[PDB]
Amino acid sequence: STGQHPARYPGAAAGEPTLDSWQEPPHNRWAFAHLGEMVPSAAVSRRPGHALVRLGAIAAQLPDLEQRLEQTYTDAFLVLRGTEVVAEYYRAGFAPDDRHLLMAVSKSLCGTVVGVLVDEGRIDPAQPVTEYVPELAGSVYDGPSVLQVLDMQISIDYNEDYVDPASEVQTHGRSAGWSTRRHGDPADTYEFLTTLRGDGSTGEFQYCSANTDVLAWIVERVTGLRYVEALSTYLWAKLDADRDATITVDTTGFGCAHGGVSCTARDLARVGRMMLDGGVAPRGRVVSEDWVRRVLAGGSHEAMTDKGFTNTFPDGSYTRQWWCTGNERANVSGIGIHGQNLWLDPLTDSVIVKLSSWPDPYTEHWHRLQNGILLDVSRALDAV
């Protein structure tokens, strides 16, 4: 068993409703107001073919930028310098206020929610995961600290290969409802997480999407809120965002913390703005100055042995669900496959959002091009 989880609605039985029960009482009072959480659904637009190009005062320094964005399958691109939007691009067919899947940029949002609860003293990063989720006893998460989950420093038998059909990340996806279930698959994400094993070693970076969903599980046990609600209460609702975000949910209503958030480019930039404002958002403080400082400082360099990342960023690292380049600008970024970045450039007090759809989840080729653009744009923002 995976223990207590936040009910889908007040008074709901465990795991209710399902796809087969949402029409029945008492579930239907909730379900009729939230049907998209149960059944795939399309928007019917209240509004009645060409790219929107407003690259502003970086266009002069980067004359070929639009072509570079097209070449990296850019859907939305936005540069926020201070509080001002100084450059924007949206491909034909993608509206400025359309939402876009964040993939693992989602992780950086989850880490932020954890940070809030650390500030409140409700989570102690030094404590074992099992202090908050006892039911992970006997799994690879039995022993490691919450900080080691935050920093992805746990050795896990989990192949995070995004193309291999046999990998654990595929099984993770089926458990999350991202793909069709196979016979024998875990019922939900919680169950899937309890199946994970490892050799027991910690301290070396291993990127694993399971870690983030463990963090969200911790958030749920500490707050009693569905992760979907926690993400709103502790982060999204404080941003004064233009639109709601969305997040995929599995059959229990558990939001896919590791990869399933969608939002507008402009609203994602508000998260970066909060980070560069020492953790304060328009409607109140989100996380502490100390938490932000620790994110910007980076993780242990020794732990970071991922040659892909370090080939580009020799002094790079990872902490608290953020990638830290350790470059001369000390850039830090949320990163998702197929070209998603929430990129922070503290030197110029700027945030760059790039949301894309590369044909491949991740290759050195796309990595090189994507980071080349983000660095060139950052530098174009420097005083001259």
Ligand X SMILES: NCCCCCC(=O)NCCCCCC(=O)O
Report DSSP letters for 188-240, one per residue. SHHHHHHT----S-BSS----HHHHHHHHHHHHHHH-S-HHHHHHHHTGGGTT
User: In this complex, which beta carbon is closest to ligand X, that of residue 5 or of residue 172?
Assistant: 172
Q: Which is nearer to a second copy, 243 or 367 (CB)?
A: 243
Residues 179-198 that bind a second copy (CB under 8 A): 179-180
- For 367, phi then psi, to 5°, come to -55, -50
> SS3 of 281, please?
strand
- The answer to the question of residue 262 lying near a second copy (CB under 8 A) is yes
Q: What sign has the CA pseudo-torsion 54, 58, 60, 63?
A: negative
| Interface with a second copy, residue 241, by CB under 8 A | yes
Residues 342/108, Cβ–Cβ less than 8 Å: yes
Of the ranges 209-217, 259-267, 345-353, 369-377, which one interacts with a second copy (CB under 8 A)?
Answer: 259-267
Question: Segment near a second copy (CB under 8 A), from 38-46, 136-144, 203-211, 341-349?
Answer: 38-46
Q: Sign (positive/negative) of CA torsion 189, 192, 194, 197?
A: negative
Part of the chain binding a second copy (CB under 8 A), chosen from 45-53, 193-201, 294-302, 318-326: 45-53
Residue 35 found at the interface with ligand X (CB under 6 A): no
How far apart are CB 259 and ligand X at their closest, in Å? 3
Strand segments, DSSP code E, in 270-360 are: 280-281, 284-285, 317-319, 322-324, 332-336, 340-345, 350-356
Q: Does 369 interact with ligand X (rule: CB under 6 A)? A: no
Distance CA 354, CA 352 (A): 7
Size of the chain in residues: 384
162 lines the binding site for ligand X (CB under 6 A): yes
Query: Residue 128: is the preceding peptide bond cis (ω within 30°)?
Result: no
Region from 23-31, 138-146, 199-207, 285-293 binding a second copy, contact rule CB under 8 A: 23-31
Q: Which of 90, 190, 291, 309 binds ligand X (CB under 6 A)?
A: 309
The binding track of 286-325 with respect to a second copy, each residue x by CB under 8 A or -, is ----------------------------------------
Backbone angles phi, psi at 261, to 5 degrees: -80, 140
Burial category of 50 from C-beta neighbours within 10 Å (exposed 0-12, middle 13-18, buried 19 and up): exposed
Which partner in a second copy, ligand X, none is near 121 (CB below 5 to 8 A by kind)? none
Q: Does 353 bind a second copy (CB under 8 A)?
A: no
Asked whether position 207 contacts a second copy by CB under 8 A, the answer is: no
Tokens coding 281: 């958002």
Task: Provide the minimum distance between the beta carbon of 107 and a second copy in the complex, in angstroms, as a whole number.
Answer: 15
- The answer to whether the beta carbons of residues 316 and 324 sit under 8 Å apart is yes
Q: Contacting a second copy (CB under 8 A), which of 7, 12, 35, 369?
A: 35
Number of residues that bind ligand X (CB under 6 A): 16
Which residue, among 260, 160, 256, has the nearest Cα to 217 in the 3D structure?
Answer: 256
> Any contact of residue 232 with a second copy (CB under 8 A)?
yes
- Asked if 234 is part of the footprint of a second copy (rule: CB under 8 A), the reply reads no
DSSP β-bridge partners for residue 76: 90, 355
Q: Which of residues 66-105 bind a second copy (CB under 8 A)?
A: 73, 75, 93-94, 98-101
Could you say whether residue 152 binds ligand X (CB under 6 A)? no
Taking CB under 6 A as the criterion, the residue among 113, 114, 169, 280 binding ligand X is: 169
Cβ neighbors of 280 (< 8 A, separation 6 or more) are 274, 286
**Stretch binding ligand X (CB under 6 A), from 32-40, 132-140, 275-283, 331-339:** 331-339
Query: Look-up: residue for tokens 């006997």?
Result: 138
In angstroms, the CA 10 to CA 227 distance is: 15
Which residues contribute to the site for a second copy (CB under 8 A)? 10, 19-20, 23, 25-26, 28-29, 31-48, 73, 75, 93-94, 98-101, 177-180, 228, 231-233, 236-249, 253, 255, 260-263, 267, 283, 338, 355, 357, 359-361
Binding site for ligand X (CB under 6 A): 103-104, 162, 169, 173, 209, 258-259, 306, 308-309, 335-337, 362, 367
